[PDB]
Every structure is written in structure tokens, then in C-alpha cells.
From a paper:
Thioredoxin (Trx), glutaredoxin (Grx), and peroxiredoxin (Prx) are redoxin proteins that are important in regulating a variety of cell redox-related processes. BNP7787 (Tavocept, Disodium-2,2'-dithio-bis-ethanesulfonate) is a novel, water soluble disulfide that has been evaluated in oncology-related clinical studies, and interaction of BNP7787 with different redoxin proteins has been a focus of research in our laboratory. These data characterize covalent BNP7787-derived mesna moieties on cysteine residues of human Grx 1, Prx 1, and Prx 4 and provide information about the functional consequences of BNP7787-mediated modifications.
Peroxiredoxin (Prx) reduces hydrogen peroxide to water and alky peroxides to their corresponding alkyl alcohols. BNP7787-modified Prx 4 also forms a donut shaped decamer. The BNP7787-derived mesna moiety was found to form a mixed disulfide with Cys 124 in all molecules of the decamer. To accommodate the BNP7787-derived mesna moiety, it appears that residues 121-126 undergo a conformational change partially unwinding the helix and exposing Cys 124. The structure beyond residue 242, containing Cys 245 is disordered; therefore, from the X-ray crystal structure it is not possible to determine if Cys 245 is modified by BNP7787 or not. Specifically, Tyr 266 and Phe 267 of the native Prx 4 structure form a hydrophobic patch on the C-terminal helix and would normally occupy the same space as the BNP7787-derived mesna moiety and Cys 124. However, the whole protein mass spectrometry indicated that 2 molecules of BNP7787-derived mesna were present and, given that Cys 148 was not modified in the crystal structure, the data support a second BNP7787-derived mesna adduct on Cys 245.
Numbering used by the authors:
A (entry chain E), B (entry chain E), C (entry chain D), D (entry chain D), E (entry chain C), F (entry chain C), ...: 77 to 242
């Protein structure tokens, strides 16, 4: 657990699925933009992926405030792609507008203190990192409870307001 | 930082101001009830204490779901009392329905990983602890951004739903 | 890496997909039989899983000489199930008669000395464990090169011949 | 505790309330003058702050012999200000001519050996620091017993006599 | 050393000169009474021993409030006796009513944190110990400056008042 | 030991018997060619050396794919030469085309993790090393079971194919 | 190693060739008898084993004075047998009435302090051990220089006379 | 301590009483001269200082052979002076022509290995040091037994003759 | 050195020559009497052994005060005998009335702090041990300078007198 | 022990008796020739010194093969002389042609691993050092049993022959 508020967010890099393709992605790619970086447990469970979908549907509300969204699980990039290429009808994600980062080595998860050593995947963790790479907000949820796009928006808008008028 | 999701929330005890009086309070007093335990930086700043007030106004929405709310800063119990006995007109808290816990020794703050060694007070941290004493949720905000009573409610309701139907 | 020829094979347990269902599985369940226990890198890659298919399709050549086969990768059991439910025409596994063990936490791969720290998955490693639970054979292949069912059969038959005839 | 008679007094700096305003203050600002530097436990307690008032009210007996006085507790500068803006008729300090230094982080109290680990505040400790920045006198009192301005004057006058006459 | 306010005063024992005779003396002998225990630097110096005389002349004022007085230096008991047997006129102490404790080994001075490693004697240190053997007060003066019987009397009386009156 | 897949094979050197003569041999001599490097337990045992013979008879099949073969045991070079100079009829190896490396000091066996501390010799271990000196394959057999030239040939060919064809 | 004059000779055990057969042999088998215990470098070298031949051919000069002889090298027991089955005319040992002790593990050589770490065999070490198993003599020779049967007899005879006549 | 025969005598320096005055004195002041350096327990005891008196009264027997004498105890220089100003008739030293070295810190006594940790003074130690500052003699006596001026002279004379005549 | 005044003299034992005969001698044999224990450098040197002969000649003066005398050097007991058996004319000791203790191992000299590590023998050390085995006196002379019997008598008589008469 | 075959013989130096005279002798003085370096227990014992006399008598047989002989014990050089000067009739060595090296410090015996810590002397060790200072041979006899000059010649001639003729 290296993630500490008002300290630079721990650096990550890896392979993400972006618009159906493998792309290399790293935290510094988002420098100059605010980033919502969130973790979810696993691809292909029997629980509908409403969060990822929800952030995906409302991506323009983040893009209109100079904010990007990246989702991460410990699954491989190949699983992410397979999950994306599986139709929602069949319990897949369907096409998605948000990068799916793979944390196969588990190092990113550990560095963000969201890794569950017992399970080998993460809990539901969400991070708001500013345009300067500084961690501004940490949200950790026990597995069965998801996240509010509305509340993430409120938080992003609030830090940006604070940045300008403070 | 001992606070870990789905692990027992770190034990605390100390003096709180409750209904204008000094009372000893400890985490175990809340066993059997869900607890919203939150930290704020300092009493008597020039910023209106809207959060404490907001949780105070809407306390019955928590009590109707078997949930209590406790606020904490590193200020002494005496400061808390003085802040409470100072009218909102003059920048005080005014009377309040929520216990104000004092973390004078700073140990509670450290155990919850919300202490700022540089400042000697906390950031805005919020914790949702269940009826069995288990940490379910951790919310850490950089100083200038407050908390949503609505979002805390959503979270408490969600964990209780999960407790019954899961 | 605690796997040593002529020493008991490191104990392992985890969730496996056995005929489309999640079952807890352990090394000790194989006591009384020879076990071929092999690691492959990742589900859902763009290589045909010819080698896993081969062991599954020729499984009776193993069972008729008192031998089972168990496959393992670092993928979750949910990824394993989905891969199984992907037809071979689409580079999936199709239905399979061999258990697919999940090593999500990586402990089993590490105990077997097959984990790759920088990739987060295993290489191609195969282990032949006798009916007494003793490790008799270790085969470790760099990624691109697969394993022969005929060579595995030869080795199993030879240890068995060796067991019976002094 | 690094405070030693005839050694330089441990350096300190922090925010103080000086005539109703926040000013950064440091030990080195007192170079050239004697300094009486004393700790009291807590603002806003149910004891009249007779002892602080005494030093403030007789401040000229110190300034006319080249001596300043600085008070300190672990309270924040915001608590100090509020206490100052509480009239003596209501057990506040009323306006005061002596700086009230804040030791929020407790580092100054610890460096002076006056911090109480289990209470989170200091005891009653008073230090006489000469114009060369050297510690000449240490007075440490258990909580209930206060300090005499007359005794402090006597000690200051004696070190000064001693300084001039060999 | 080991002297801390509100902790038992560090135990000591040694030879003292009481009314012109060597007696074994210990801290525990004073249990049930308050004790003013002070250190002075050296016998036979070129300075008049005003402190020790003043405590001896006004002893009944301490005895009448259930308080004893013990003085101590690093000098041997033989030096103490000779100093007493030297008439005040000639730089001696003359007959005295206070015990003169010898701390030849330096251990007592070290335990009270008054020993000066480079000088081989103590600074001017004074300790107020209550009837239960708890240390209530620590006064440490740089060499040139002595102690006030009035002040000491005030502190003893204040601790006894606070003891009894709640 | 130090042998790891996709790392340079641990360096070795020693005396070998090549066409009936002692020659100094080293791993680096084989750079630019593939190398099958294998260990066998002991010369002069009561078992026919079928493995070593088979590799020697079919050597041209390795030479024609730019691959050399080296066999090794803990026996001395003198024992190797005598074993070669013993006719197969009488339990000897007879003339051979593969070098017989001596690992008298045991260091090579230890570096390859094939040494048996309680027996004083190796198990049956086989290593495939590429032309760049990188280790591609590790095969470790419990004592009774030998090695297949077909399998070895298959693995060499597969690594060379994958080398070239992307 | 641990071999020390007038201390018990370091225990050893292992497999030896005794009249064409493999027997387990230990130092304790020689209790009640003097033992000449010697090491030689290697079997099958290009020098006639005149040393070993001589002790064997002259064994009765030892047995008739209650003394046994054991030869040792790091060669395996199979190498020892092959060597014995090689005729003296052809460079071999021919039949021999002294056990050839195998030290494959090197432990015995190391306990006797005769092992050459750089070469992986022994120098020429001879040890005379009495009937109580106490080490009475150590003779260590650099490699090219052999031992004398007459000198060894003289020492044995001398030690026994010494035993008998005080 | 560090005092060793035929090694340089441990350096010392401190304040001594030399003809009624305080002088700083160091071991190096005696280079070019033999030095008799001795320790005695304490000033002002109830035994006449016959030892010290004797060396003082007989000093010319040392000076006429290029030898000086220094006496030391742990007493302060002020105690030494008082003692000197006490008449021999009254138990004191009377005037004395030998320096009385003060060892208040105890360091010198400890360097000479004569300090008694339990008593806080020295035993009776005498040291003969040559003109090059090399320690030639150590005489240590348990407390109740004094030194002989005739023996010390005989040793000094013996060391000088030895120096002169090889 | 382990010898320390007023502590038990380090235990010793060894072989002494007493009236031309080898006897085992121990420090404890002297319990109930005073012991003059002294070391000289070496037997058979060109210096006349005056000290040993002096103590020998005057032995009755010690025995009449219940005191024994033992002489020691690092020489073997055999050297002591030969030296005793060599006439003073031809550079020997001649018959002597004092035990000559051998410290061949050097351990006794080491315990007594008289051993010269660079020479392999002792300087001239003399020790006075009382009837309860407590060391009372340490005399260490640099090599050239011998010891006085008169001085040694004086010290013994002094220790015995102060033992008796308080 | 630091002596090791085929390593440089441990350096030694000391005082030897050579033709009745004290000379400083060093191992390096023997460079360019072979050296028989041997230890015996002690001078002046009741055992006839046959070994030393034998090597002495036959010294020309060594000198004609470019070989010197040095004898050592722990005795002082003075003891060696006296022993040499004592006629064989009266239990001495008598004139001898071989240097008698003194190892008074015991350091040479320790480096050679011949020192008996419990006796303070050596057992019977013999060492053959070549012309380049390399140790070629170690012979260690338990005390009673002496050494043979014929055997020692045989070994020297053997080492020199194998030095020359490859
Ligand atoms: S995945 C949950 C949404 S819906 O497809 O069931 O409508
Ligand atoms: S404290 C902010 C609310 S209001 O009093 O200004 O209305
Ligand atoms: S990816 C598997 C290829 S095939 O099954 O279509 O032959
Ligand atoms: S609390 C202060 C008491 S007074 O100022 O009213 O006298
Ligand atoms: S010695 C005390 C006498 S006075 O200095 O106070 O006059
Ligand atoms: S020694 C090899 C001959 S056979 O056993 O294969 O017949
Ligand atoms: S190894 C036999 C050779 S010879 O000495 O007998 O000639
Ligand atoms: S201290 C003087 C006493 S006496 O020996 O001179 O009698
Ligand atoms: S040691 C020489 C003195 S004397 O015995 O010969 O007199
Ligand atoms: S050492 C006794 C033998 S001999 O020299 O007396 O012949």
C-alpha cells in the first residue's frame, strides 16, 4: 500500500484493451487530465457488470471535464478481450468505451492496497488522481457494494473547483 | 494504518461530547449497530462545518436503519464543547446530535491511516463499520472536499441489503 | 520452488472446473493413482490450445493405466469456465474431461517453480506424481514449445514398470 | 527530550496567535533577548487560566529587562484564537499580549520533554532561554500546580546579574 | 536519567551527615512525609552556601507541614562533615539542621539527571517528592543561580492542597 | 541451483573424453550451435547404457540440425575413458561419438540442480540450450527412467522453428 | 576436518567392494583391532597402483598383529569393482583382499581433511587408528608421492608396544 | 583500564592544588623527568595521611634524582585546598610541596584501573613513569595498607640505573 | 587480566617442583594461610636468580607469620628441575626451599595479567593473597627490576595486622 | 592449523640455538632448499632424545640432497642452550648439528596444528617444505612414537625426483 492522499499516485503500466485492441497504458499517459482509476474483482462472473457499463455510458460527462476513466482487474488482457467480445446476452461485457487494464502480475493492485491475498483478486477500489498525477481521493468498498458515477462526478467536480478557487 | 476492509475495524476509546456532556466512548459500544465513524480536520476554522451539521440534521435516517454516526477530530474534548457552545452566528458548531470524539493523543487517527504527520490533524476520512465490528467501507478525501450524507446512506443501505440477501 | 524429484509433491488445492462446474480439488484427492499435473500460460490466447485438447481427447490412454490428468493456469475458475464454453471452432477449449484448476493467487505456480514474476503467468511445466504422492518427473518448457502426450505416456508407463519390477 | 541546561535550547517553529493574528514564529526570532517559554496543558478547561493571564498582565516587568514570554499548548492556532476571543468573565483568556504558540504535531512538546504520551497534552513546564539561545533553567510541574511570575522574574534577573558580573 | 513527574522518584541510598554524625539514609525513610530533595555542586567553594543555610534556618516551616529537606552533592561524607565543622566565617557551612547526603559514586546524580559529565559534579537541581514517593516537581538551574525557600514552600503547599482538596 | 529457463545456461568447464582422448571442454565452445546437455548417474553400473548409445548412433540427426550432444556424470575422466575402453559385451560403453564430461568436483551438477546430496551423483537430467547460450528446456527424471532421442529431437526442432518463424 | 590425534577417529560408513561384492562398511566394524585407514586419489589412472597393491599383497603382516587395512577414494563402488576386475598387467588392481571404500559424497574425505576442493578427489592421506578407535597417526602426502608399507608397520608396531608397556 | 607496563602511561590532565593555588596539570608536564604518580582514597578521613605527608616531607630525595611526585584522589580541588589548610595537628595535611590532583570526573582513576565502582573512590595505586612517559611500575594495594617512600625510591633508583647501564 | 584487588585471586593449578620432586599444586592448597605468589621471566638465563634465592633464604620469616611463597614462570616442570639441579656456579638455581610452579600453558600468567604476548613469558609480577583466597596486593615490575623481601614482609604483616585489629 | 598441503608453509621466525649460539632464524632463510621442519615435545625430560641425535648424526645425508633440518619445541632458547650444554650422560642433548628453534610464544606450533592446548606443548609433528616454500608432507605422531630418518629421506628424495622428472 503506497497510495497516499496528496502524494503522487503510484505509477502503473501494463496492457489494456482499448476499442477491442491491445494497447500499452501507463498512469503518466493521463498527466494533464484528471483520472478515475478503479478496480473491480473479476471478468466473467455471474454478476452483471453494471459499474463498468455505467461509467461507459456516461463517459462524456467525464470527458467534458477533462477527465478520463480506466478500469482494472487482475485478469489477463486476453480475458478482458474475450469478455468484451462476449455479448451481454451471454453474460459478457459487450463493447465498451473505457480502457480495461490488466493487472496479471498483481503488482498494481498491491501498490494500490486493493489486493486480497486470500482471493488473488481485488476488492472494489476507486481512485481520483489529478492532472498533476496527485492522489486526491480513495474509495474502498467491500466486494458486494458498487460505486456511484454520480458520486464520482461530484468528487471530480469538487476537486477541480478547489483547484481553481482555493 | 491498521484499518483493513472485511477485517475488524481498529478499536478506539476516548472522551466525546454527547448532548453537551463529557462521556467515555469506545467502538465496542456500537457493536450490534452499524456505525458511520468519520474524521474532520479541526474545530474553530473559518470554514462552515456543513458536514457535521448535515449528518446531524439527517440522523433519524441513520437511526431508522440501525445506524449511528460519530465524528472525530484531534481537538480536545474541551475544544469540542467550546465549539458546540459557540453559536453558528459566531462560527461555532451550535448544538449537535452527533457525538464529537476527541483524538488528542492522535492514536485513533494513526490507527485509521487518516493522520497528517505534517499538519498534526487528519484529512477527511469516513468509515462504515458493520454491526459485528467489521470494516466495510473506507472513504478518504483530500482536505477541501467534503462528504455526501446521501452517498453514505446509499452505502449503509447497500451493505445491509447484502447482509440479508447475499 | 519446493518441488523435488523423489520428495512428496508440494500440496495444492483450489477451485477447478470439472465438467462445467466449480469443485474444490486437491492433490490428496489423487492418492492411489498416478497424476499428470501440468501448467499452461493463459486461457483465451490467439494460439489453438492443441496441447490441452490432446490430453483431454486421449484421456483414456491415461485412465486405463491408473493415471489422472489435471491442467492449471493462473486464470480464475470463471475464465476457465468461459473458455470451456467457447467452441474449438472459435479457439476455445470446448467441453473437456480434464479438470481445469485455477491458480489465481499464484501460490501453486510458485510452489511448483513455474511462475514467471515479470509476466504474471506460468511457463509450460509438467509434473508426474506417483500414487504415493511422490514427484517422479519434471518437464519445464520455454513458452512457445508444447508437450507430447506420447512422451508423457512413455514416462508414466516407465515409472509404473519400474514400480512393479524392483 | 533534547533540552539540556547550558546547551542551546531545542529549535522550534510553528504558528502562533499574536494580537489576534496567525504569524509564523520561531525560537531564533528571540535571539538578542531572554525568553521565558512555557507550556500549559489545554485551552478551554474549567480552570481559570490565572497563570497565563499573570504573565500577560505583568509583561512589562519582563520587557523592561530585555525579556520576552511565549506560551504554548498542543491546541491548534484556531483554538488559541477562539480562546483569546472568549472573555475572562466566561473563563476565556481575553485579549493577550503574549504569543500563543500552537504545538499541534506535538514535536515541540516532545523536543522539550513535556509531552504526556497517555493524555496527549503537556504538563506545566517552563524554560528560561538566554539571549545567546542557551537553556539556563527548567521548571517542570505536575498538572495541578501553576507557576509564579515573581519566581520567574527572580530567576531571569539572577541569570542576567550572573551574565554581567563574571 | 530516570526521574519523571508523577512516577515514583528514583530510589536512592547513601551516607549522610545528620547532626554531625554519619547515618545511612534512604528515600524510603521519608515515606509518609513530603520531601524536598536538592543537589548543590560542591563543598568548600569560594561562594557562601546561602541556599543550604536558608533551608536550615526555616526548617520548622517545612516540618510544620509534614515536609523534610535533604541536600546532596557528589562530595564524600567526610568532606561534608569537615565542611560543617568549618565555621561560616572561614568559608565553612557551620552546624546545620538539614542532612547532607553524599553521592560519591555519582549514581544518584545520574538517576536524577543532574550530573555534569565534564565537570564531575551536579548542577543546582531540586525535586519535590510526595508522601507516597511520587515525584511532583523538577527544578533545574544552571550553576550560578540558587533556589528560593519561599518558592519551594509555595510548591509544597500547593501540592498538598491539591492532594487533599480533590 | 542456478539453471532457469530463458536465462543463460550456467557456465561449465571440465575434462571430457572425446574420441578416446582427454580434452578441456566448456559450454562457450558450443556457442552458435544448439546443445543437448544431459547428466546420467554412474559409469560401470549393472544397467546397459542405452540412452548414451542411442544419442551416439543417431548423432547425425542432431548434427544435421546444427545441434551437439554432451553427456555428463560425476565420474572422473579416467573412469569415463576406462568405461569407453570396456566392450559393451562386458558392461562397458564401447567406443562412442558423444563427449563424456566429468563432474568430479560436483559443481556442475549442483549448478544444474541435478545433484543428489545423499547419493553423491546426479539424477537423470537433460537440458536444451540454444545457440545464444540461453536455456530453453529442463527435463528431470527420477533414476530408473531414461530419455528419448525422438522427444529430444522434437524439442530441439520446435525451438529452432519458433526461433526463426517469428 | 575433524580428525584430531588422540581423539576418536571421525566415524565413517559407506559401501565398499569386499571380495568382488558390495558390503556396507563402517569404522565401528574395526573396534577391537588397529586400523590402517588410507585415501588415494583416483581409480583407473595411468600409474600402476603400487601403493595399494603392496598393502594388499602384504596384508598378513598387518593381520598377524591385529591390524586391518582399508583403502578409500571418491570413486563409486562400481568404479572400484571394475578396477579390481581389470588385471594388474593391464593397469588395473586385479583381485585385492583389502576393502575399497567408496566416498562418492565426499563427506568422509572432508571429515578426514583430505579432500581437494579444486580437484574433486583426495590427496594421499593415511590414518592409524587404535583398537579403541582413537586416532594415533596422520600422514598426509602431496599427490606424486606414495606410502611405505614398512613405515606403516613400524608405526603400528610402535603404537602397540607403547600401549602394552605403558 | 589502559595502564600497561612498558606502554606510554595513560595521558591525564586536570586541576591540582600547587602551593595553595589552582593550576591545570597534565602528565606531559613531567616529560624529561621520572614521575611517581599515586592515588589515595579520600581527603578528610579519620586517619592521619602519613603516606602523603611522608612523600612530601621527603620530596628532595626524589628531586635530587630527577623525579617528581604527584598525589591524586577523586576529591575536588576545593576539598584538596581545604584539606591542605587544615593543620596536621587537627587531622589535616598542612602545607605540602606535592601537587594534589583532583579526579572529580573519575576518568583518570578509571584510566589507571584504580577506581572502585562500588565506593566511588580509588584504592591505593602507585605508578612509576619514566622520563619518556613510559609506565615502568604498578603497585596496587587494598585500602588499609599504605606505601613506603623507601621502596618507591629503591624502584626509581633501580629503573634509572637500568636505563643508564643497558 | 582477571586478577582484581579484594576479589578472589584467580584459581590456578599445575605442576611444581618441591624439594626436587614433581607435585600437583593448587591455589586452594594455601587456604588458611597468606600466600606470596610471584612470577619471574625464565629459567637458565644469564641473570643471577637473586630474588628466588633471597625469598628461599628467608623463608622462615614468612612461615613464622603463617605465610607461604610460590614462584612461577612459563618454563616446563622439567626445565625447573634441571635448573634446580644445576649448581649456581654453572648458572643454575641450586637447591631451593620454594616451590617452582610451571605455567607451560601460559594460562596462569594470562589470568594474572603478567603475560607478555610478544615474548612468550611474564614480566615480574608479585601477588599477596590472604587466608580466604582474596587478592590484597598487586606489584608489577618491568623486567629489569627485581623485588624486595623486606617490602614483601612489610606488606604481609600490614595486611595481617589490619585483618586482626579492625 | 594453517598448514595445508601444496600451500605455502606458514611463515615462522624466532630464536634458534645454532652451534651453541643464539641466532634469529626464519622460514624464508631456507628458500632454495628443501626443509625438514619437525617438532618434539620438551627439553630435559627423562626420554632419551634419539630422534634429534639421529637426524643430527645423519645430517650430511640431507645436505648432500640440498635439504636442511630444523627441530622445534616450546622451550625458551635459554632452555635449548642449557639442554645442549648438558652431557647425554647427565640427561642432556649434548652438542648437536641441528638448529633448535624456540617456540616460546606457542604461535608457531599453533600455525602448524601441532600445539596441545591442554599440555602447553606439541605432539610429534614433522613437515617437508620444498625449495619454493610449499608444504609437501605432514606427519603427526601421538607423543610416544618417534620418527624415522630413513622414511624422511625417502620422502624428500621422492619429492625432489617428481619435481625434476615431471
Ligand atoms: S445485466 C442487468 C441488466 S439486464 O440485461 O438484465 O436488463
Ligand atoms: S455556515 C453556512 C450556512 S449559512 O449560515 O451562511 O447560511
Ligand atoms: S484453434 C483450433 C483449430 S481447429 O479445431 O479448427 O482445427
Ligand atoms: S475564570 C476568571 C475568574 S474572574 O476573571 O472572573 O475573576
Ligand atoms: S556565608 C553567608 C554570609 S553572607 O554572604 O550571606 O553575608
Ligand atoms: S548394453 C545394450 C544392449 S541391450 O540391453 O539393449 O540389449
Ligand atoms: S601397471 C604394470 C606395469 S609394470 O611395472 O608391471 O611394468
Ligand atoms: S593526625 C595526628 C595524630 S598524631 O600521630 O600526631 O598523634
Ligand atoms: S647467582 C651468582 C651469585 S653466587 O651464588 O655465585 O654467589
Ligand atoms: S640418550 C642415552 C643414549 S646414550 O647417548 O647415553 O648412548
Amino acid at each position: 500500500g503506497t497510495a497516499k492522499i496528496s502524494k503522487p499516485a503510484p505509477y502503473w503500466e501494463g496492457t489494456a484493451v482499448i476499442d477491442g485492441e491491445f494497447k500499452e497504458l501507463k498512469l503518466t499517459d493521463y498527466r494533464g487530465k484528471y483520472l478515475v482509476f478503479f478496480f473491480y474483482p473479476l471478468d466473467f462472473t455471474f454478476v452483471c457488470p453494471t459499474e463498468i457499463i455505467a461509467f461507459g455510458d456516461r463517459l462524456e460527462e467525464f470527458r467534458s471535464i477533462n477527465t478520463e476513466v480506466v478500469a482494472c482487474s487482475v485478469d489477463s488482457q486476453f480475458t478482458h478481450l474475450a469478455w468484451i467480445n462476449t455479448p451481454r446476452r451471454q453474460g459478457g461485457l459487450g463493447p465498451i468505451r473505457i480502457p480495461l487494464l490488466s493487472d496479471l502480475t498483481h503488482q498494481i493492485s498491491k501498490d494500490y492496497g486493493v489486493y486480497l491475498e486470500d482471493s488473488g483478486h481485488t476488492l472494489r477500489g476507486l481512485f481520483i488522481i489529478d492532472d498533476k498525477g496527485i492522489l486526491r481521493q480513495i474509495t474502498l468498498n467491500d466486494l458486494p457494494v458498487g460505486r456511484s458515477v454520480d458520486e464520482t462526478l461530484r468528487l471530480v467536480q469538487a476537486f477541480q473547483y478547489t483547484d481553481k478557487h482555493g
